[PDB]
Amino acid sequence: RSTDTFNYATYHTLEEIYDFLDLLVAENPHLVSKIQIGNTYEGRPIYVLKFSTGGSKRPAIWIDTGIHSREWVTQASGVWFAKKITQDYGQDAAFTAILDTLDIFLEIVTNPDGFAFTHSTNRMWRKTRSHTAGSLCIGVDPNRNWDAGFGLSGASSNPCSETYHGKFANSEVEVKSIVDFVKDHGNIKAFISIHSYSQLLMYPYGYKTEPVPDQDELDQLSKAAVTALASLYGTKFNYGSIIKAIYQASGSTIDWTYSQGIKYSFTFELRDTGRYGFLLPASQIIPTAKETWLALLTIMEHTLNHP
Amino acid sequence: VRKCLSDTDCTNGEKCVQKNKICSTIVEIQRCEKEHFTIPCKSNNDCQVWAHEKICNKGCCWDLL
Ligand SMILES: C[As](C)(=O)[O-]
Ligand SMILES: C[As](C)(=O)[O-]
Ligand SMILES: C[As](C)(=O)[O-]
Ligand SMILES: C[As](C)(=O)[O-]
Ligand code: NA
Ligand SMILES: [Zn+2]
Ligand SMILES: [Zn+2]
Ligand SMILES: [Zn+2]
Ligand SMILES: [Zn+2]
Ligand SMILES: [Zn+2]
Ligand SMILES: [Zn+2]
Ligand SMILES: [Zn+2]
Numbered sequence: 617r618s619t620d621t622f623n624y625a626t627y628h629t630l631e632e633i634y635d636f637l638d639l640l641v642a643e644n645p646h647l648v649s650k651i652q653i654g655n656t657y658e659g660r661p662i663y664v665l666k667f668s669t670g671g672s673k674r675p676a677i678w679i680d681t682g683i684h685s686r687e688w689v690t691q692a693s694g695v696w697f698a699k700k701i702t703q704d705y706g707q708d709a710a711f712t713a714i715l716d717t718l719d720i721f722l723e724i725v726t727n728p729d730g731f732a733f734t735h736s737t738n739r740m741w742r743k744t745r746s747h748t749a750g751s752l753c754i755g756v757d758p759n760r761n762w763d764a765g766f767g768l769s770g771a772s773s774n775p776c777s778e779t780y781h782g783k784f785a786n787s788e789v790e791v792k793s794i795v796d797f798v799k800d801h802g803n804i805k806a807f808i809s810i811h812s813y814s815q816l817l818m819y820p821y822g823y824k825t826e827p828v829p830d831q832d833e834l835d836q837l838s839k840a841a842v843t844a845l846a847s848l849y850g851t852k853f854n855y856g857s858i859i860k861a862i863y864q865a866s867g868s869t870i871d872w873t874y875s876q877g878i879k880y881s882f883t884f885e886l887r888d889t890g891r892y893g894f895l896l897p898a899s900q901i902i903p904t905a906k907e908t909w910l911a912l913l914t915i916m917e918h919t920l921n922h923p
Numbered sequence: 924v925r926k927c928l929s930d931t932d933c934t935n936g937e938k939c940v941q942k943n944k945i946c947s948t949i950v951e952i953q954r955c956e957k958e959h960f961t962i963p964c965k966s967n968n969d970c971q972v973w974a975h976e977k978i979c980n981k982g983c984c985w986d987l988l
């Protein structure tokens with residue numbers, strides 16, 4: 617068993633994905649490392665892959681998948697991105713130039729407890745698996761738990777809600793673990809948090825209508841990115857602020873990362889537009905990952921050329 | 924919102940959406956199906972037929988994404 621025998625065209629278990637992390641590191645020990653950033657509510661390790669050609673605290677790109685556990689094409693795409701980086705570094709000039717200046721951090725299973733639960737118990741589970749005092753409903757929406765507009769309109773006070781914000785910002789260890797990593801690093805330049813579905817590329821804000829200070833640059837980059845994505849199979853993405861493109865959402869990841877001075881803070885919604893929704897056929901994993909990678913490259917290149 | 928059991932309970936040429944038993948224009952029925960593979964709504968209450976919570980957003984029953 618190697619990362620060449622791994623089947624990228626099918627959906628996997630947590631244990632299988634964690635095996636893939638270890639095989640990729642073992643096969644590429646001078647390019648890839650595995651960092652444990654924490655443990656989940658139920659005690660599972662939380663792992664980030666670092667792709668680096670050297671240096672100390674180089675400017676970096678962060679990408680996360682699977683913050684919402686049911687969004688399976690995202691974790692499946694994250695596995696594919698990881699393999700892709702190792703395939704292209706040293707082979708494709710443009711990508712080689714990217715990794716020669718920037719590090720990439722990739723968190724493939726951002727909510728492992730939820731992910732396990734989607735296989736074991738409830739395929740449509742979204743939230744964390746934390747228990748909440750005063751309710752028998754389990755879990756907090758990890759994308760309403762960040763300390764940017766926390767608890768304001770765009771989240772629920774009902775623990776049973778899919779958008780329950782939690783007792784306080786960063787209550788969820790899955791969120792706090794990233795917060796700590798990001799602040800300790802101090803030099804992440806782009807932060808991309810990947811969801812499905814709806815075929816959107818979005819930038820701040822989710823919690824308020826006020827334009828983000830870098831609105832025009834971010835909207836310009838968004839158009840370039842969705843154009844690149846579309847080149848492969850013609851998949852149409854729309855783009856805009858979270859609040860305009862989807863709905864008001866408070867305590868969301870990229871509003872917080874943007875508040876840390878990470879200018880290129882983006883969130884994706886991958887395929888499709890609802891025909892299959894969260895239950896995207898496995899035959900679409902690789903095409904989804906391929907087209908998304910083109911958008912990610914656009915963002916990384918822009919980040920590189922605007923140091 | 925206007926509730927219905929058949930198209931004859933609606934007005935202004937609207938049709939009865941059978942999934943949630945509300946009246947909607949054909950244009951809105953078409954848009955929600957084409958753009959979002961879902962049904963129209965006037966409020967969150969019109970999206971309750973799914974055990975997995977959906978919301979009414981921009982005239983259609985959306986998932987939390
Ligand atoms: C439990 As196994 C055979 O996927 O390592
Ligand atoms: C530098 As070595 C221990 O992979 O030969
Ligand atoms: C150059 As080597 C594969 O021994 O680290
Ligand atoms: C080529 As440009 C408009 O992203 O600086
Ligand atoms: Na907690
Ligand atoms: Zn190989
Ligand atoms: Zn297995
Ligand atoms: Zn194993
Ligand atoms: Zn070696
Ligand atoms: Zn399974
Ligand atoms: Zn650019
Ligand atoms: Zn520029």
Ligand SMILES: [Zn+2]
Nearest residue numbers: 958959981983
């Ligand atoms: Zn729409």
Ligand SMILES: [Zn+2]
Nearest residue numbers: 684811812988
């Ligand atoms: Zn999501």
